[PDB]
């Protein structure tokens, strides 16, 4: 049973915790609760093989940015999240990608670009510009909704497969 260390990164309020909790605890409650650093673990079957998923749910706030170097070094795969109704978070996602590559010093870090909150009608970030960004990054793009659970498993499992391909 191989262990996978996943890290959920992105600007504050994009839905990192909601996404993680939806996957681990299979539920969604609308609540305001900024993260410092939370850790989860759940054994799950992916592609006919049970493995251990360690999920580090990080802080979107700049207040806890000094912790980035440490978790980027240990993290094996990163779920780069942004909200489709938050243009700024989409712009911030570029910074996370470059920082991860810088810290790890690798041009092939397992990553998955996630466009969360796809349940909301007020879209300000078109799927096309996100797909093109993911294409340029050479990683997959998955739109999710921690509320409806749409694409949640796909996003995390695709990151796991990405890590497996790299490892």
């Amino acid at each position: 049973m191989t262990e996978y260390k996943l890290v959920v990164v992105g600007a504050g309020g994009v839905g990192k915790s909601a996404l993680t909790i939806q996957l681990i605890q299979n539920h969604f409650v609308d609540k305001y609760d900024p993260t410092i650093e939370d850790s989860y673990r759940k054994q799950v079957v992916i592609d006919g093989e049970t493995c251990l998923l360690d999920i580090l749910d990080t802080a979107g706030q700049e207040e806890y940015s000094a912790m980035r170097d440490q978790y980027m070094r240990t993290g094996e795969g990163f779920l780069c999240v942004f909200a489709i109704n938050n243009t700024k978070s989409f712009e911030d996602i570029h910074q996370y990608r470059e920082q991860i590559k810088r810290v790890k010093d690798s041009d092939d870090v397992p990553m998955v670009l996630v466009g969360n909150k796809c349940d909301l009608a007020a879209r300000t970030v078109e799927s096309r510009q996100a797909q093109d960004l993911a294409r340029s990054y050479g990683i997959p793009y998955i739109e999710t909704s921690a509320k409806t659970r749409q694409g949640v498993e796909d996003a995390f499992y695709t990151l796991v497969r990405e890590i497996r391909q790299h490892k």
Binding site: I24, Q25, V29, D38, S39
Partner: protein, 87 residues
């Protein structure tokens, strides 16, 4: 404005390993317990039935007095790992 980031774990089995919260120098046990409970979604419950223990190791655990200033009571030279459990 001194404070520290501590890791609080629950004595249950719900997929969560721990959830980090902040402990300021003004935080007394009741304050941190309610903060930990909320973070772990224990809003219905009362902080009265809850206890706060610092995990120094697998053999050593520091019981935080019910009205002590957590910032000054905790072993700062040890791991900031705490467990929230029912008394």
């Amino acid at each position: 404005g001194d404070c520290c980031i501590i890791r609080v774990s629950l004595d249950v089995d719900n997929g969560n390993m721990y959830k980090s919260i902040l402990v300021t120098s003004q935080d007394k046990a009741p304050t941190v317990i309610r903060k930990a409970m909320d973070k772990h979604n224990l809003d219905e419950d009362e902080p009265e039935d809850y206890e706060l223990l610092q995990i120094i190791s697998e053999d050593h655990k520091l019981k935080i007095p019910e009205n002590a200033n957590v910032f000054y009571a905790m072993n700062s030279a040890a791991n900031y790992d705490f467990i929230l459990k029912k008394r």
